[PDB]
Design a binder for this molecule. Structure first.
Ligand SMILES: Nc1ncnc2c1ncn2[C@@H]1O[C@H](COP(=O)(O)OP(=O)(O)O)[C@@H](O)[C@H]1O
Ligand SMILES: [Zn+2]
Ligand SMILES: [Zn+2]
Length: 185
C-alpha cells in the first residue's frame, strides 16, 4: 500500500529520516525523476516551512527545522511533498503556469493525496494555524534565493515592497544586488 495515513501520522517523530523520506517519495510518487534534486534540513530558516531553489539544472529543497521539528509527522511529509511537486515541475520544464500553484500543481497534489490519503495543500501554512500570517510575498531573483537564512524571501503584512526604506537594503545591494519580484498578500 502507498497509504501514509497510518497510526503515527498525527504524532511527532523524534527521529525523522528526511533523506529516507525523499528517496521513498521520489520512487513512489515521482517516477524516480528527482535524481538531481537534493533535500536538506535548515536549523536557521523561519519565513517558510519549506522552500525550493532552482539554479535554472540543479534543484534544492530546504525544510525548516525550527518550524517542523516539533510538529506531527504529517506536517513534515505534506511540506516535503509540496516542495517535491514544485521540484518536479521545474525538472520537467512544466512550471509555466501563471499561478504559483496552478493546474499542473493540483494534478500532482490531488493525485498524491489520492494514493496516500494525505492532504497536501496549495497554501503554505499548517492546517491548524489561524489567520495571523503575512500574505504579501516577494522573492529575490538574485543569488540570495540559495542563501541562508531567508532564501530570497520577504513576507509582509501589506503591499510594502522591499526598498531603500529597509535597514538591510544596502547590505543586500552589496551581497546580492538582485530584484524582489512580487509573488502573496
Ligand atoms: N541582509 C538581508 N538580505 C535580505 N533580506 C533580508 C536581510 N535582512 C533582513 N532581510 C529581510 O527582512 C526580514 C526581517 O525583517 P523584520 O526585521 O522582521 O521587519 P519586518 O516587520 O519588515 O518584516 C527577513 O525575514 C528578510 O525578509
Ligand atoms: Zn508552494
Ligand atoms: Zn537577493
Amino acid at each position: 500500500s502507498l497509504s501514509l495515513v497510518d497510526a503515527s501520522w498525527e504524532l511527532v517523530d523524534p527521529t525523522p529520516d528526511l533523506q529516507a523520506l525523499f528517496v521513498q517519495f521520489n520512487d513512489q510518487f515521482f517516477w524516480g525523476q528527482l535524481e538531481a534534486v537534493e533535500v536538506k534540513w535548515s536549523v536557521r530558516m523561519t519565513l517558510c516551512a519549506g522552500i525550493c531553489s532552482y539554479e535554472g539544472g540543479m534543484c534544492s529543497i530546504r525544510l525548516s527545522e525550527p518550524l517542523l521539528k516539533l510538529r506531527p509527522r504529517k506536517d513534515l511529509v505534506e511540506t516535503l511533498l509540496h516542495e517535491m511537486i514544485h521540484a518536479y515541475l521545474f525538472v520537467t520544464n512544466n512550471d509555466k503556469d501563471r499561478e504559483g500553484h496552478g493546474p499542473e500543481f493540483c494534478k500532482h497534489m490531488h493525485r498524491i493525496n489520492s494514493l496516500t490519503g494525505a492532504n497536501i495543500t496549495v497554501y503554505h501554512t499548517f492546517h491548524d494555524e489561524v489567520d495571523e500570517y503575512r500574505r504579501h510575498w516577494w522573492r529575490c531573483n538574485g543569488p540570495c534565493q540559495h542563501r541562508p537564512p531567508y532564501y530570497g524571501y520577504v513576507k509582509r503584512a501589506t503591499n510594502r515592497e522591499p526598498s531603500a526604506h529597509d535597514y538591510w537594503w544596502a547590505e543586500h545591494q552589496k551581497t546580492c544586488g538582485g530584484t524582489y519580484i512580487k509573488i502573496k498578500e
